[PDB]
Amino acid sequence: REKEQFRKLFIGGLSFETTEESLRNYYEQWGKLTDCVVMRDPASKRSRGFGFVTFSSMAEVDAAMAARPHSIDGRVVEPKRAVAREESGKPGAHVTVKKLFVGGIKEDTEEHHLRDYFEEYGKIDTIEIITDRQSGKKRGFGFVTFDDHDPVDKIVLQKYHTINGHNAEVRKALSRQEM
RNA sequence: AAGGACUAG
């Protein structure tokens, strides 16, 4: 079995009517849930409008996310790979973006290496290898833009990736202000 | 629309 963080979705924009039974019933169409929670105010027990579901495998998670959009109790819900509590509060931790920064790729990594590595995670719209305008030389990083945010969210659960023989690193692409 | 905990031997 895989790490729990890799099996967990945050589910945003729940109806205040949605319960753990109705959330469980819905998400159980893509696999077994080992945990299901709707967050509630501790005194009023009023729903806070989000919860989490945890599948028995990451393949189940992927199967659910391949079947978006999701709706429960008449609301279109907003599932997202769960961001670990340690990460929450770091700059850009909860951003929703289609673009991924790939660093540590040095000077021999081309567009086609990023394509071949990343296209299993989703549909790629654009790849940009960054070069120094003056020297022409690759600067050791690039950006991969997918057609959806979910590939980016999935990829960045794992910080370190071997890419083209390098010890590469992935980050969600941020504007300078989100940084 | 960002975490509830049989999370005190």
Residue numbers in the entry: 15 to 193
The authors write:
As a core component of the hnRNP complex in mammalian cells, hnRNP A2/B1 is an abundant protein and has been implicated in numerous biological processes. The B1 isoform contains an insertion of 12 amino acids (aa) at its N terminus. Both isoforms have an RNA-binding domain (RBD) composed of tandem RRMs separated by a 15-aa linker, and a C-terminal Gly-rich low complexity (LC) region that includes a prion-like domain (PrLD), an RGG box, and a PY-motif containing a M9 nuclear localization signal (PY-NLS). Here, we determined the crystal structures of the tandem RRMs of hnRNP A2/B1 in complex with various RNA substrates, revealing the molecular details of specific target RNA recognition and shedding light on the mechanism for hnRNP A2/B1 in various RNA-mediated biological functions. The two RRM domains in hnRNP A2/B1 interact with each other extensively in a fixed antiparallel orientation, and the binding surfaces of RRM1 and RRM2 align in the same plane, which forces hnRNP A2/B1 to bind two antiparallel RNA strands or a single-stranded RNA with a long connecting loop.
ITC results confirmed that the 10-nt RNA oligo 5′-A0A1G2G3A4C5U6A7G8C9-3′ (termed 10mer RNA) has a higher affinity. We successfully obtained the crystal of hnRNP A2/B1(12–195) in complex with the 10mer RNA, which was determined to 1.85 Å resolution. However, this time the RNA molecule is recognized by both RRM1 and RRM2 from two hnRNP A2/B1 molecules, of which the other one is from the asymmetric molecule. The 10mer RNA molecule adopts a single-stranded conformation accommodated into a positively charged groove comprised by the canonical RNA-binding surface of the RRM1 and RRM2 from two hnRNP A2/B1 proteins, in a 5′–3′ direction from RRM1 to RRM2. Unlike the complex structure of 8mer RNA in which only RRM1 is involved in specific recognition, the complex structure containing 10mer RNA also shows specific recognition by RRM2. Due to the higher resolution, more detailed interactions are observed in the complex structure of 10mer RNA than in the 8mer RNA complex. Unlike the 8mer RNA complex structure, the UAG motif in the 10mer RNA is specifically recognized by RRM2. The side chain of Arg185 hydrogen bonds to both the 2′-OH and O2 group of U6, and the N3 and O4 groups are hydrogen bonded to the side chain of Glu183 and Arg99, respectively. The base of A7 is also clamped by Phe115 and Met193 through hydrophobic interactions; N7 of A7 forms hydrogen bond with Arg185; N1, N6, and the phosphate group are hydrogen bonded to the main chain of Leu188, Lys186, and the side chain of Arg185, respectively. In addition to the hydrogen bond formed between phosphate group of G8 and the side chain of Arg153, the O6 of G8 base is recognized by the side chain of Lys113, and the base of G8 has another π–π stacking with Phe157.
